[PDB]
């Protein structure tokens, strides 16, 4: 009966996870090769990207770990005894034609 | 790993100009510079954290 | 007791009952094995 005048502080904690924003036209995982990565606007043309993150201020130098999700694929060929040939390809952020 | 200064609020990053075919999405998390070693180096002498 | 099986004899493992991403809970639709 002697309760003070109080205000509500709301927050959330979401540990262990990565804030996924899928590059899909409805934010749904209908496949890994999404419909916007197959879109001819984003397939045959070049586009700049400027992302802007507003974060809580911390009294410590922090980092920002962004996963630019790609297709980091390796195809491995062994044609003869002792021979180990690999072809690497990741798209979009290509290191390039890393055939061995 | 884009560096965020101390008590900094806005973090502008910029991927310059590129074809975005087969792009899947983003996933991001703030880290700490104390808790993240500068990998690629064989030894980080400024990494006093275990 | 046994995973689902097609019969083409040969005896072929059937892919039914496997887990998927669904916008609606999968127990009210199907049986998940």
């Amino acid at each position: 009966k002697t309760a003070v005048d109080s205000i509500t502080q709301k927050k959330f904690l979401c540990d262990r996870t990565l804030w996924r924003i899928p590059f899909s036209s409805n934010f749904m995982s209908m496949g890994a090769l999404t419909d916007l990565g197959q879109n001819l606007l984003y397939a045959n043309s070049a586009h700049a990207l400027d992302m802007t993150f507003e974060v809580d201020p911390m009294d410590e130098p922090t980092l920002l770990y962004v996963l630019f999700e790609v297709f980091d694929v390796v195809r491995v060929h062994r044609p003869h005894r002792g021979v180990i040939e690999t072809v690497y390809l990741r798209t979009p952020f290509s290191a390039g034609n890393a055939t061995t | 790993l884009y560096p965020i200064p101390a008590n900094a609020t806005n973090v502008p990053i910029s991927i310059p100009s590129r074809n975005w075919a087969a792009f899947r999405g983003w996933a991001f998390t703030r880290l700490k510079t104390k808790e993240t070693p500068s990998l690629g180096s064989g030894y980080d002498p400024y990494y006093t954290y275990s | 007791p046994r995973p689902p099986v097609e019969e083409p004899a040969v005896e072929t493992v059937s892919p039914e009952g496997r887990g998927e991403k669904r916008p609606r809970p999968d127990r009210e639709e199907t049986l998940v094995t």
């Binding site: 995982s29 999404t34 | - | 004899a9 005896e11 493992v13 892919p15």
Partner: peptide, 29 residues
């Protein structure tokens, strides 16, 4: 057709499925 390499459940080989030969496991899709 490599059906003598399969364990016989009964009198027939317990062959796998065609669609299980690959993989599509990937983080987030």
């Amino acid at each position: 057709n490599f059906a003598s390499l399969a364990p016989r459940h009964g009198s027939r080989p317990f062959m796998g499925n065609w669609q299980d030969i690959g993989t599509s496991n990937m983080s987030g899709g």
